[PDB]
């Protein structure tokens, strides 16, 4: 990566809005973290709950559907870490809710395994499929922690 | 083997 893209990715991760605004161009808004998993700025902003940065990147042409090296999209990151507002922003901008990574994990697998009831609910309202099996043969329901009976009920 | 996604739950 050029130094500028590196700084952009770090700023997206840190939620440094002003630096994002300075460095975000048509050429860099969908740049990829080559030294790592080829995450985009939107992958970082989504995973680290940087809401202002997520909104800015989306407005400026960031690809909600962009897959990293593992086939994860920013929605996977938001759901894994319980960032409800970010998840809603991505979904409202057309994010595919049944998107599957290289291991066939979906956002619902993430939200279910991580005990995020409201995100599970959001995903289901948008057509997320609780019967989708990952590479291990596990559905999102299969991944729910024993104590999370509310999420079990929701997904069943 | 699937690594954890980029990100974290708590800002703190």
Curated annotation (Swiss-Prot), chain A:
<feature type="repeat" description="ANK 12">
    <location>
        <begin position="103"/>
        <end position="135"/>
    </location>
</feature>
<comment type="similarity">
    <text>Belongs to the ARTD/PARP family.</text>
</comment>
<feature type="region of interest" description="HIF1AN-binding">
    <location>
        <begin position="57"/>
        <end position="65"/>
    </location>
</feature>
<feature type="repeat" description="ANK 10">
    <location>
        <begin position="37"/>
        <end position="69"/>
    </location>
</feature>
<feature type="modified residue" description="(3S)-3-hydroxyhistidine; by HIF1AN; partial">
    <location>
        <position position="65"/>
    </location>
</feature>
<comment type="function">
    <text>Poly-ADP-ribosyltransferase involved in various processes such as Wnt signaling pathway, telomere length and vesicle trafficking. Acts as an activator of the Wnt signaling pathway by mediating poly-ADP-ribosylation of AXIN1 and AXIN2, 2 key components of the beta-catenin destruction complex: poly-ADP-ribosylated target proteins are recognized by RNF146, which mediates their ubiquitination and subsequent degradation. Also mediates poly-ADP-ribosylation of BLZF1 and CASC3, followed by recruitment of RNF146 and subsequent ubiquitination.</text>
</comment>
<feature type="modified residue" description="(3S)-3-hydroxyasparagine; by HIF1AN; partial">
    <location>
        <position position="30"/>
    </location>
</feature>
<protein>
    <recommendedName>
        <fullName>Poly [ADP-ribose] polymerase tankyrase-2</fullName>
    </recommendedName>
</protein>
<comment type="subunit">
    <text>Oligomerizes and associates with TNKS. Interacts with the cytoplasmic domain of LNPEP/Otase in SLC2A4/GLUT4-vesicles. Binds to the N-terminus of Grb14 and TRF1 with its ankyrin repeat region. Interacts with HIF1AN. Interacts with RNF146; this interaction leads to ubiquitination and proteasomal degradation. Interacts with NUMA1.</text>
</comment>
<feature type="repeat" description="ANK 11">
    <location>
        <begin position="70"/>
        <end position="102"/>
    </location>
</feature>
<feature type="modified residue" description="(3S)-3-hydroxyasparagine; by HIF1AN; partial">
    <location>
        <position position="98"/>
    </location>
</feature>
